[PDB]
Every structure is written in C-alpha cells, then in structure tokens.
Amino acid sequence: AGVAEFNDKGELLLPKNYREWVMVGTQVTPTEIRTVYVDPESYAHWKKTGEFRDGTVTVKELVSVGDRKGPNGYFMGDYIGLEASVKDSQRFANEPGNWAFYIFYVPDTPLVAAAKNLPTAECAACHKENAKTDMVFTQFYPVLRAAKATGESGVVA
C-alpha cells in the first residue's frame, strides 16, 4: 500500500521527510529548478524490476534559482512549490494508470496540509500522453535508468 498517508476525506497529506527519499532527476527551466524524488521502498522495487510498484509516491519540488559568482553558477534558492503523484490500483481504480496528481503549493496558491487529487485535463493527460514509463518522465531521470539497466545506485569501477 506504500508510504502515502490520506486523511478521512481521502486527501493526500504532505509527505514527511521526502528530501530524504531518492532524488531521481533534477531539471532546470530557462528561472526554476525542479528536484524529483521517489520514496525509498518504491525505488528499491524499481531497482529489482524496472517497474513502479502499487503504492509508489513521487514528489516534485520547485525552487527559484540563486546566482553564484566565483570563487560562476546557479544553485537552488528558495522553495516555491511542491507537487506529488501517487500510484494505487485500489484507491485510484478509475484514474489513468491508477495515478493521482496533487499540488501542495505553487507560486501563490498557498500551502495546504492536505491536497485533493486533480482533474485529468490538468495533470494526468500530459503525463499519460508524453511520459516514457507508466506516467512518470523517466526519459529525464538518469538515476532510474542506471538503477533499472544495471541495478546500481552509483558509478561502479
């Protein structure tokens, strides 16, 4: 059933300590950096199978960009947004791929402790139309690639 926690009305509670999950890719929009996490048990399953288990949770964390000069570059600035997706064949039996999509906050919609699953036109449509693997954009996540192709979570000599 996985790591997702839901309140009585079925809203997804803010995942806890997700920055300790496995970071699978980071993207930059030319302004924003996005960091993508997969919960450790789902990542472990992925290593073994190249599949997203029932109960998989992903988190996408949005940051502004800081500028470094010397001793030049960009770095993760302020946290400005948080999205998540959850796979559950039972709870989301009627959603495409059994995935539900969520916004916790973005440039201003204020932060909620619990989020309602979003309509397919808003989120799932793009994902199911374009994502390489089961509605997750693994074409952009080299941590997952090395994990699936070789069972590894790092370079090996």
Three-state secondary structure of the chain: CCCCCECCCCCEECCCCHHHCEEEEEEEECCEEEEEEECHHHHHHHHHHCCCCCCCEEEEEEEEEEEECCCCEEEEEEEEEEEEEEECCCCCCCCHHHEEEEEEEECCECCCCEECCCCCCCCHHHHHHHCCECCECHHHCHHHHHHHHHCCCCCCC
Name every residue whose Cβ is closer than 8 Å to that of residue 32 and which is 6 or more positions away in sequence: 62, 63, 64, 65, 80
Q: Which residues are annotated as a binding site for heme c?
A: 34, 60, 68, 123, 126-127, 137, 141
| Distance of closest approach, residue 111 Cβ to ligand HEC, in angstroms | 14
- Residues 129-148 interacting with a copy of itself (rule: CB under 8 A): 129-130, 140-143, 146-147
| Distance of closest approach, residue 143 Cβ to a copy of itself, in angstroms | 5
Fill in the per-residue mask, 54 to 93: x = in contact with ligand HEC (CB under 6 A), - = not in contact.
----x-x----------x-x---------xxx--------
Tokens matching residue 49: 């199978």
Q: Is 154 in the site for a copy of itself (CB under 8 A)?
A: yes
- Residues 19-48 interacting with a copy of itself (rule: CB under 8 A): 19-20, 22-23, 25-30, 33, 35, 40, 43
Residue 83 binds which of ligand HEC, a copy of itself, none (CB < 5-8 A, kind-dependent): ligand HEC
The one among 41, 79, 128, 134 contacting a copy of itself by CB under 8 A: 79
Residues in touch with a copy of itself (CB under 8 A): 14-20, 22-23, 25-30, 33, 35, 40, 43, 63, 65-66, 68, 70-79, 82, 104-105, 111-113, 126, 129-130, 140-143, 146-147, 152-157
